[PDB]
Amino acid sequence: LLNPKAESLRRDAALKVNVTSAEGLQSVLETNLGPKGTLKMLVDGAGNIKLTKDGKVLLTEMQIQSPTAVLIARAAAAQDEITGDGTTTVVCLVGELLRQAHRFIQEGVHPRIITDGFEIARKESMKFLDEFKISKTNLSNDREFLLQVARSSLLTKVDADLTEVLTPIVTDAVLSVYDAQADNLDLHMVEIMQMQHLSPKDTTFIKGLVLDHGGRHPDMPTRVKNAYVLILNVSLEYEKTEVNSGFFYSSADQRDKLAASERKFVDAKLKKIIDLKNEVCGMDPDKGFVIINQKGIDPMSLDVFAKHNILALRRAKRRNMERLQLVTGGEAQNSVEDLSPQILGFSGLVYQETIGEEKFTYVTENTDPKSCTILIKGSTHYALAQTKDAVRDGLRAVANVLKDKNIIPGAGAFYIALSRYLRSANMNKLGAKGKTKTGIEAFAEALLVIPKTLVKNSGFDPLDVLAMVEDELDDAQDSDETRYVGVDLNIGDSCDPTIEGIWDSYRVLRNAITGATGIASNLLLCDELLRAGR
Amino acid sequence: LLNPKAESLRRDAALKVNVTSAEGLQSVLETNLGPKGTLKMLVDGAGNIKLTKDGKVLLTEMQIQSPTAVLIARAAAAQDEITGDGTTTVVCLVGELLRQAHRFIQEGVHPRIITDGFEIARKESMKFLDEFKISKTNLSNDREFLLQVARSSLLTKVDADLTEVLTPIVTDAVLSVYDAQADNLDLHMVEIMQMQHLSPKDTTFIKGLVLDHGGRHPDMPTRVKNAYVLILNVSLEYEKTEVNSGFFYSSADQRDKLAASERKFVDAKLKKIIDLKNEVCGMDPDKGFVIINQKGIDPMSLDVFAKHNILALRRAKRRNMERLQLVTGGEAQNSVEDLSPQILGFSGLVYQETIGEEKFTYVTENTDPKSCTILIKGSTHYALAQTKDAVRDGLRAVANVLKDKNIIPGAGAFYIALSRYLRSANMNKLGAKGKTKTGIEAFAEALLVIPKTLVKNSGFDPLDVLAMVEDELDDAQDSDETRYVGVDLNIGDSCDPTIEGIWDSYRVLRNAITGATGIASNLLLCDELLRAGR
Amino acid sequence: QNPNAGLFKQGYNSYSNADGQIIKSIAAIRELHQMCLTSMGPCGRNKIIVNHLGKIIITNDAATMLRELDIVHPAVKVLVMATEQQKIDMGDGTNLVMILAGELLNVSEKLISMGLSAVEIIQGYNMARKFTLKELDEMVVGEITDKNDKNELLKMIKPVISSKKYGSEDILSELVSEAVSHVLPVAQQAGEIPYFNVDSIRVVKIMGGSLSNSTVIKGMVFNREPEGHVKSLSEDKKHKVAVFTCPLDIANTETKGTVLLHNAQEMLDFSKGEEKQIDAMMKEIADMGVECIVAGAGVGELALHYLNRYGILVLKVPSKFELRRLCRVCGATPLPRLGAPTPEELGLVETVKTMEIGGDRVTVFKQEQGEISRTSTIILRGATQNNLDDIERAIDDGVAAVKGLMKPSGGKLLPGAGATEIELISRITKYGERTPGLLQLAIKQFAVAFEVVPRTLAETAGLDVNEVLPNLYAAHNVTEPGAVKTDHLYKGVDIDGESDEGVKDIREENIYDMLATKKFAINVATEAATTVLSIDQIIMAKK
Incomplete structure (x- = not known):
């Protein structure tokens, strides 16, 4: 056969x-x-x-x-x-x-x-x-029991030393996203970010959102506490004519006059932005103004924003602009002509953690962020991969505990x-x-x-x-x-x-x-x- | 290492x-x-x-x-x-x-x-x-239960068709050698002898002892209902002078005179044997006389013993002659000069089963034989080996039932x-x-x-x-x-x-x-x- | 590198039942089974056997083949010893026990492949064997009355000659039945004393002539010559014969009596001494009235010369086996010594002569209606010594077949040539449907295993197997107005030699096998077939 x-x-x-x-x-x-x-x-x-x-x-x-x-x-x-x-x-x-x-x-x-x-x-x-x-019980004061559920999902994949590090991070990540009622929980509101150069035991929890590009200028303030947030969609850098043209200067100083005249259109919007800070809490302590602006910013505007002590961000991820809009509360501003102080959001202490190569700006201490972040730290890619497996499986383990009583x-x-x-x-x-x-x-x-x-x-x-x-x-x-x-x-x-x-x-x-x-x-x-x- | x-x-x-x-x-x-x-x-x-x-x-x-x-x-x-x-x-x-x-x-x-x-x-x-x-119970009337013990032993080593044949053989073998009033038994008293040229279903039990060499003469009696048994060590055949001598005959008739004169010493003992039959129960019915005599017997004495209707056996095993002392009870007669009717034993029906190649003599029906015989029949060698293994294992299995209560x-x-x-x-x-x-x-x-x-x-x-x-x-x-x-x-x-x-x-x-x-x-x-x- | 499992014993070879040795054992037996399938039947084939001594022989009988073959394999040795079990107790059925037990294993393989346990296979045949042995007692048609008539012997011997030597069946039947009737005495209602010894019929054969010139005489026949100058005795009845164990020569002394020679004067006296003594001894012996001296030992020169002057026929018989049968005829008894022929020791014979058989003259020993003889001799003649020797083997099996007729219900008969086989198949299927349980599968295959015998006769005869099989079934399957199915059970497997069509009645040619041979063959073959199925493993070890 x-x-x-x-x-x-x-x-x-x-x-x-x-x-x-x-x-x-x-x-x-x-x-x-x-x-x-x-x-x-x-x-x-x-x-x-x-x-x-x-x-x-x-x-x-x-x-x-x-x-x-x-x-x-x-x-x-x-x-x-x-x-x-x-x-x-x-x-x-x-x-x-x-x-x-x-x-x-x-x-x-x-x-x-x-x-x-x-x-x-x-x-x-x-x-x-x-x-x-x-x-x-359905009580959300059960964190003591959540400490037991956390050790169940943690101790398995780690040496038990990272458990005490990840125990307050995972437990606070779930209860901060989860409102108090029976509704649901969203795991997408917790961001997973990985960084190098620091030991994995120093992994910390981020109540706000973390981002890469910071304000570039030596005199910009590193730590700003309880500052208003501006989400801006308009380009503050130098712009060029949409049609082919040229700048013909008769004198050496006229070359800088033609360049300043073209930037004057952007400088006109720049003056309206700095007047907003002069209008609202200019000299007031414990209050500040931050530019998260999505498009690029030339170094000339960065020097002007530094004298005003304004944090200016440029080239921000499109997904983060909508996330920072919900966390901070400030609406996305497409045009400076419609800029108003009622549109501005509010955030807490914003401080830049600056390593050698990179700068880390923190959005934390927010009134109604409704989004968390878990920043995974490690020296090599081995600790970053093992921790990411413990975080993803650790959040889903606690998630099934609130869904299933x-x-x-x-x-x-x-x-x-x-x-x-x-x-x-x-x-x-x-x-x-x-x-x-x-x-x-x-x-x-x-x-x-x-x-x-x-x-x-x-x-x-x-x-x-x-x-x-x-x-x-x-x-x-x-x-x-x-x-x-x-x-x-x-x-x-x-x-x-x-x-x-x-x-x-x-x-x-x-x-x-x-x-x-x-x-x-x-x-x-x-x-x-x-x-x-x- | x-x-x-x-x-x-x-x-x-x-x-x-x-x-x-x-x-x-x-x-x-x-x-x-x-x-x-x-x-x-x-x-x-x-x-x-x-x-x-x-x-x-x-x-x-x-x-x-x-x-x-x-x-x-x-x-x-x-x-x-x-x-x-x-x-x-x-x-x-x-x-x-x-x-x-x-x-x-x-x-x-x-x-x-x-x-x-x-x-x-x-x-x-x-x-x-x-x-x-x-x-x-130690009672020997338990044969009905012994029929069950026999089946337990036999059904393993046989096709179960030989069970009905070997069940009355093995059960009667153990109880016959088993001594009354809760004594022991001897398995050596049961003799196991194999024969060829018959079917295994023809296997029968022998209450007495069976002998190999039978009487050779056409007029020997087929069966004798009751007979007096003689155990004799004396040679009845032609013998020679105890001292060196010779027979010198002038004529053929003189040679017969010298041959009869030498056999006269045996004939003198032969006359004492045949006259002893008429001395005790000679004319009495249901009485007979049998010669199991060990040494050889010439055909001249076989013709004389045939006229008297006396069965004459010759060339018997020395070990079988000692077994007849227990089976028959007759003492061994070393000399005919001392022969007496008190030496002879009594036995029951003695009938010679005549097969062309092999003649069988049955000593059975004895007063106190105290020895059994199991005659195993088979055409081939493996048929005898399989049955013998069933008998040897069957006799010891039943013996352990009487020994161990x-x-x-x-x-x-x-x-x-x-x-x-x-x-x-x-x-x-x-x-x-x-x-x-x-x-x-x-x-x-x-x-x-x-x-x-x-x-x-x-x-x-x-x-x-x-x-x-x-x-x-x-x-x-x-x-x-x-x-x-x-x-x-x-x-x-x-x-x-x-x-x-x-x-x-x-x-x-x-x-x-x-x-x-x-x-x-x-x-x-x-x-x-x-x-x-x- | 590659390990091996299942063998822990001394690097031997042992087939476990999981490897299907039983199927392999049947396959090895199937090779030997096909050898016998061309043997049984008058249309069977002859096999040439070249002996290790440089002698080429040919024979139909398979039992002779198994003795010439060296059998080692254990599954085959069971049937070889079972064939010897068929060789004893009867002289027929050698090809019956081999083909039957071989097919019982062939149909057993279909049950093994089905998954039916071998113990349940053996249990099925044991129950079906008891049903067959009980039915064969009621399937008997006629019974031999043991009248010992020549015509009654022609009915039994004729089918026995068939399947061994064909074409000589009717010719050899008159030769065998005549010699058997000479040994069979005249008696009735006496079963106590057995009779009809096989050695009582001697068969001699001489080259030349044919089977038509073969005759039957009452007496022994000796091939040796009439040493004495008297070729034959007279026609007068009752001649005295003396059987001498001692050679014919001067008598010696029972004590020593060693001849020694010293001087030539003694040598001259030894010649004259033996001359006068032998002349005196042979005289007195011939004076006792004995005209024929049978010497079991050598005969001297002077001893033979003196008996020739007295007209004494001298016939030497060195074989003691022939002297024993000579005593049962003439009545003489062998004398160990010489010189005393007692008339009570002397016998009587009517005619001792020398006849020319096949061109050579031999001295016979015979009688006519007197001093009755218990020994007879068949004189065979033929041109080919080979085929003539096979005739002797067919006669010896025919004599043993008559020995099959005795007290243990031997006279019972059953129709042969596949007539009983096909009928028994339908009767076993009747037992199958009536017996509930798993035995139905084994009982039906037990009846199908009997289809090999009728198919064998049709295959060796050149007939079409597909045509003959339904003709056998339709003949034994009929519709009758009653429980007993009436007129004709006699339809067999027809061996034609003619042209046209069909089967025949057993009553026509009276070709049948006795019940004693068939009942004994089935019981041994089935027990041998169930024996082979009992061994699922073999183990060889050093003795």
């Missing part, structure tokens, strides 16, 4: 390849899990080395011919768009679930019964999912309890089927991979901690009270995940159990592999 | 090879396990064919290069020296116990906890062994119950250790190999038949009573092993659990495999 230029793997031989295909992808990603995970290198082929612990960036940068890992990577990409966290968690659940299933495949169990046992246990897992979850404790508390749940429930219930008991038991034993590999990457004996946690759960059930138990990676014993502050999102775990079950199910449904047309 | 001519397997890969080598022997010998198993054939290279399902008889005839299977072959050798049956069962228990431990070895569990968990489970197995065992129900009743017991006991007890739970659970799951193998050779679904037994055990446990459950290989459902008549010896299962645990533990205790001179 063959034709030329074809390959076929049939009669359970495809199952041994597909399960091994999952064991190969699992062992690679088994190294990095939780805060004890590992760092990997990704070569794009252009010579740029990128170090990241995020499974989202890993699966996209690597090319795998194995079709089993392709479906895992494609399904994890859907999980990365929905959950945004726990990419490795999904892979570890799929691989181990196929390993426990492959042992029953060698026993002669049909894969449909194995997949049916996973779907029945998944429906019972969703019932325990709603029972085990903890309902968190339900939260679940982490540290394997959900996986160990549910595995013990299906073990004791299926024996008491016995309402599924006799042959389904294999699929249910394999699914319950496969979910132990996360708490086993989490402490395995920590170095502690997994058999010891899983025994102490199981004994503590049995002692908790004998005392007849609710006790949440989780693994402690630093000490190696058990602990309380609610006290330790380790929490897992509800939407992440809801799509992880349902997603990993659907991934491994479709892989067991493949009896034969076929390669044709090649 | 090496010197010339050395090979060493050091790390955990060494133990993986020893287990895998033991897993290879398991797959070979699991096919012949149970009455539904397969019959293996052996060839010594010289053209000898041997058909046996016994584990040791196979292992002793095969040469194994694998060092792990050699220890199993040495362990199976000690099982036959003690139990005599179940050598294949021990192999299936050792291999699967290593496979179930291999899963935990890959988890990083040290083999000491694995071996210590087997010893703790072995002690609990012995505690369950005393509670699960059944005490059988304790009995255990078969059909996996001890294996399935102990596997379910140890799993539920360790959870309620919890008196071993937390890490020992792996070794205890691995042993309980390793006890399922026998009931899964019996249905594997039968072809039935092992998962379906096991769930039906677990449902019956759970229903019997909830009903609060004692119900022994076993797997029915013919129908495929469960069965009561007490009603179906499938019984296993107590000594077989006592040394099997202890023997398989000690050997499998010693294999796990191996740290390094050293090879010298290879």
Whole structure:
């Protein structure tokens, strides 16, 4: 049963390849899990080395011919768009679930019964999912609990020293953008900017917006406190005639007169701008005037604006002009003829942080900015790439906490309890089927991979901690009270995940159990592999 | 770390090879396990064919290069020296116990906890062994139950058609040599002799002793209802003078005179033998006289003995002459001069079965023979070897029932119950250790190999038949009573092993659990495999 | 670099059941099965066997072939020893047990590829074998009354000669049945004493002539010459014969008696001594009334000369096996010594003469209606010694076939030439539908396995296989107004030699096989077929 230029793997031989295909992808990603995970290198082929612990960036940068890992990577990409966290968690659940299933495949169990046992246990897992979850209050004074959610998304990908740096940055970034009510939150209002020349531990949060081009003149004020803002669209630099012409000077001084006469049209608008500062808080302290003007400005106007102590910006990004319009409040002024003091906005202290090569102007201390900025600092591109992965996944982690009022404790508390749940429930219930008991038991034993590999990457004996946690759960059930138990990676014993502050999102775990079950199910449904047309 | 001519397997890969080598022997010998198993054939290279399902008889005839299977072959050798049956069962228990431990070895569990968990489970197995065992009455009227023990022994080594033939033969063989009033029995009293040129279904039981050399003369009696037996050491054939002499005859008639004068010494003893028949019960009906005489008999005496209708045997084995002292009771007569009617013994029907190539003499129907004979018939050599292996294993299996008053129900009743017991006991007890739970659970799951193998050779679904037994055990446990459950290989459902008549010896299962645990533990205790001179 | 799994034993070769050895074992047996497919039947083929001693022979019988072939492979050795099991207890069925057990394995492969367990395959044949052996008891048509008539022997011997030597069937039937009737005594209602020994019929063959010149005589026939000057005895009945174990020469002393020579005077006395003593010994022996001396040992020169003057026929028989059968005829007994021919030790024979057979003269031993003989001899004549030797093998199997008629229900018969085969197939399918369970798959394949015998006879005869098969089915499948299907069960596989069409009735040519041979062949072949399926692995090791 063959034709030329074809390959076929049939009669359970495809199952041994597909399960091994999952064991190969699992062992690679088994190294990095939780805060004890590992760092990997990704070569794009252009010579740029990128170090990241995020499974989202890993699966996209690597090319795998194995079709089993392709479906895992494609399904994890859907999980990365929905959950945004726990990419490795999904892979570890799929691989181990196929390993426990492959042992029953060698026993002669049909894969449909194995997949049916996973779907029945998944429906019972969703019932325990709603029972085990903890309902968190909607109060926005919960920052203490947000400090626990932050450490969950931070400690994983960082040395834990950048955690204390990024903890006040991420937590203040979400609550500043989020108004107090139930409405929504916008992650686009938080800008992510990267800079060099300074250590990553000095990364700071920017309440306002950050920009590159500053006022160029030695005498311009560096620090201006509580100044009015002007958004100006008109070019203050030298202009030329729209039609071809020339300047013919009879005398040497006439050459400067013709140049001053052409700039007089721009100088006429320049006089109307400086009269606005003389009209409003010219000599008044704690008040100033700033020119964010979008188009270019010649050095002659920069010298005039410096004598007035006016900060003058030129060649500003078009997107930032609309963003600074909402942050500062001042409307965009196309023509100076319509310039009025009521159009001017208001901002707080504007101070230029000037390194050797570059100058940084800060818009911060705004009345109603409604836009934040996270400025990522690093000496090399390694710290800039690793921090950007922690910021993007850190903001989306807290974002799912305000959108979903339900939260679940982490540290394997959900996986160990549910595995013990299906073990004791299926024996008491016995309402599924006799042959389904294999699929249910394999699914319950496969979910132990996360708490086993989490402490395995920590170095502690997994058999010891899983025994102490199981004994503590049995002692908790004998005392007849609710006790949440989780693994402690630093000490190696058990602990309380609610006290330790380790929490897992509800939407992440809801799509992880349902997603990993659907991934491994479709892989067991493949009896034969076929390669044709090649 | 090496010197010339050395090979060493050091790390955990060494133990993986020893287990895998033991897993290879398991797959070979699991096919012949149970009455539904397969019959293996052996060839010594010289053209000898041997058909046996016994584990040791196979292992002793095969040469194994694998060092792990050699220890199993040495362990199976000690099982036959003690139990005599179940050598294949021990192999299936050792291999699967290593496979179930291999899963935990890959988890990083040290083999000491694995071996210590087997010893703790072995002690609990012995505690369950005393509670699960059944005490059988010493009464010898239990033949109805012995018919069930015979089937348990026979159905394994035969097609089940020879079972109905060998069941009355083996059962009558043990009880006939079994002494009354709870004494012991001697299996040496039952003689096993093979013959050719008849079908194996014609195998019959011989209550007395059978002799090879029969009386040669056409007028010898076919059957004698009752006869007086004479055991004689005196030669009845032509002899020579004790001192050197010669016969010089002038005529042919003188030569007959010298020949008759020399035979006259034998004829004088011949007249005392034939007159002794008329001396005691000569004219009495249902009386006869038989000559088993050891030394040769000339055809001249055979013609005289034929006229008297006396069966004359010659050239008898010296060992068989001593057996007739116990079977018949007649004393050995060294000299005819001292011959007396008190020396002769009494026997029942003696009939010579005449086959063209072979003549048979039956000493049967004796007052106190105290020796049996099993005559095995077959056309070929392998038909005699397979039946002889079933008789030797059948006589010892029934002998262990009378010697050991304790009995255990078969059909996996001890294996399935102990596997379910140890799993539920360790959870309620919890008196071993937390890490020992792996070794205890691995042993309980390793006890399922026998009931899964019996249905594997039968072809039935092992998962379906096991769930039906677990449902019956759970229903019997909830009903609060004692119900022994076993797997029915013919129908495929469960069965009561007490009603179906499938019984296993107590000594077989006592040394099997202890023997398989000690050997499998010693294999796990191996740290390094050293090879010298290879 | 590439490892190897499955072999841990001493670098040997052992096929696991997962590798499909049972399918491979059947394939190896299928090579031997095709050898017997061209053997069975009168249209079968002959195979030339070149011995390692430089002797070229040709024979139809496969049991002789298996003895000339060196059998090693274990799956083949089972049927070879099963063929020897067919060779004992009967003289026919050598090609029956080989083809039958070979096809039982052929149809077993279709069940193995289906996934049916080999144990469930063996269990299916064991249940179907008991259904067949029980039905064959009711499928019997006639039964031999053991009348021992010549015409009754022609009915049994005629089909036995077929499938071995064809065209000589009717000619050899009158020759074999005549010699058997001479050994068979006249008795009825006596089953206690067995009779009809195979060695009681001797077969001698001389080159020349044809089968038309072959005759049947009552007595033993010896190829040795009449050493004495008397070629033949008279026509007077009851001549006395003395069988001597001691050679004919001067008698010796039972103690020592070693001849020694010292001086030439003793040598002259040794010649005259042996001259007077032998003349005195041969005299007194001939004076006892014995006219024929059969010497089992050598005969001296002077001892032969003196018996020629007394008219004593001297015939030497060095073979002790022929002297034993000579005692059952003449009645004489061998004497270990010489010089005392006791008349009670002497026998009687009517005619001892020398006849020319095929151009060579041989001295025979015979009788006419007196001093009854338990041993007969068939004298065969033919031009080709090769084919004439194969005639002797067909007669010996015909004598063993008559030995198949005895007390253990041997007289029962069944129609042959595929007549019983096709009928038995429809009767087993009747058992298949009535027996519920998975056995239906094994029972039906058990009946299909019996289609090899009728297809074999049609294939070797040049007939069209596609045409003969439905003619066999349509003949045994009829619609009758009742439970018993009546007139004609006699439709067989027709071996024509003629032109036109169809099958024939067994009653026409009276060609059938006895029930004793067919019932024993099926039981052994099925047990041998279920035996091969019992071995899923073989292991060879150093003894």
